[PDB]
Amino acid sequence: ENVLTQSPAIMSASPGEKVTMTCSASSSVNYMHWYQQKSSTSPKLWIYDTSKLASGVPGRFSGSGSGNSYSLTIRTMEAEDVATYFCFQASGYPLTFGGGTKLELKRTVAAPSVFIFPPSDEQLKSGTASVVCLLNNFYPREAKVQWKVDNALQSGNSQESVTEQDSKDSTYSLSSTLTLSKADYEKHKVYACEVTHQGLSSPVTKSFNRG
């Protein structure tokens, strides 16, 4: 098939910065089309026949190129431009899309708010304890959440989940869940999460006592 390679695959840009992304085909094509996808909803046609903006699409976006090499450019990066962008060719079968270019907004440092939730009484009666650490509205994405049970570091028993970048403020939120049986949970007294993040002077710890 005609493979489309998009570069770069991951990219960030500060607000007002010029961004450009390329799509390269292994064989020449008549045109390249571009789709914007936000937060796993349907793709939206963004640019068609190489350089025509679909309706609604602002004039800071443009595409160009010919043959095997196409580009999508944004002259001034905005918060609403955060998305994945896919190129597409329909000049020969099988029709093919690129692997996408994920565009992040590179905003100012913001320190997380941190919350800890003990398991509910209703979960405990079913035989399980989920303890939850929430990191709300922070930037950049890199954070270190560490669980301590009776001041002992945990390993391999917590799962993390991260939101996409917020439309308005461009921050992230993160939950981490420490899961164990009720019998194991009732054998320890103090549960704590410790957050490290460049928006924070020293690591922040939130904790509770079973009871």
């Binding site: 045109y31 349907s42 793709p43 996408g100 509910s120 979960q123 799962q159």
Partner: protein
């Protein structure tokens, strides 16, 4: 006004067959080709095939003629049929149509199909009990994706972060939804999370109360 809408099963077993229907509106099927595209979860886009107005078809050859696309003009429906399923076929499936030229300009909402020998399970929903307070619900142990969560039936959208589901080591998904609110309003306002899992016909409305 061109509209497309897909419907299909949420869950089917390996080696069985998948079939999805697209109901269309705003154009003649005799005149216009309709295509199918899928997206494996957290990956890119793949074109599957097209049925032209005259009824002829083109398929992606990688599918090994496991795919058939058909239509009925009087019903305004286009049918995707995919045989001898592998877990690799798990994806969001979209019906789509070009506008001007060959770029796809109209997309359905898409329909997630999970291919697995595992069975439906509805979630359990547990409160994460709470000048800024966080509160939440833990939506645990469900299969397959997806779950929809709203707070106070949509009335509350500011402050709401719903995390991506995580596959636990048990083969079940879990997710959390949180909302930030002022401390002051905890004693006055009630907060209820509305959780919906279509594949099991589970609707849970859960009060989250201070402890």
């Amino acid at each position: 006004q061109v509209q497309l809408k897909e419907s299909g099963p949420g869950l089917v077993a390996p080696s069985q067959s998948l079939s999805i229907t697209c109901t269309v509106s705003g154009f003649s099927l005799n005149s216009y080709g309709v295509s199918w595209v899928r997206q494996p979860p957290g990956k890119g886009l793949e074109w599957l095939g097209v049925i032209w107005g005259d009824g002829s078809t083109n398929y992606h050859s990688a599918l090994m003629s496991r795919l058939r696309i058909s239509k009925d003009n009087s019903k305004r429906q286009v049918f995707l049929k995919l045989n001898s399923l592998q877990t690799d076929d798990t994806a969001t499936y979209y019906c789509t149509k070009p506008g001007s030229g060959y770029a796809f300009a109209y997309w359905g909402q898409g329909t997630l199909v999970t291919v697995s020998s595992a069975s439906t399970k509805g979630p359990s929903v547990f409160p994460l009990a709470p000048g800024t307070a966080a509160l939440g619900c833990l939506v645990k142990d469900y299969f397959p994706e997806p779950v929809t969560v709203s707070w106070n039936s949509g009335a509350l959208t500011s402050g709401v972060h719903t995390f991506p589901a995580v596959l636990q080591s048990s083969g079940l998904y879990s997710l959390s939804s949180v909302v930030t609110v002022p401390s002051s309003s905890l004693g006055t306002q009630t907060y209820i999370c509305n959780v919906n899992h279509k594949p099991s016909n589970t609707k849970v409305d859960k009060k989250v109360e201070p402890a």
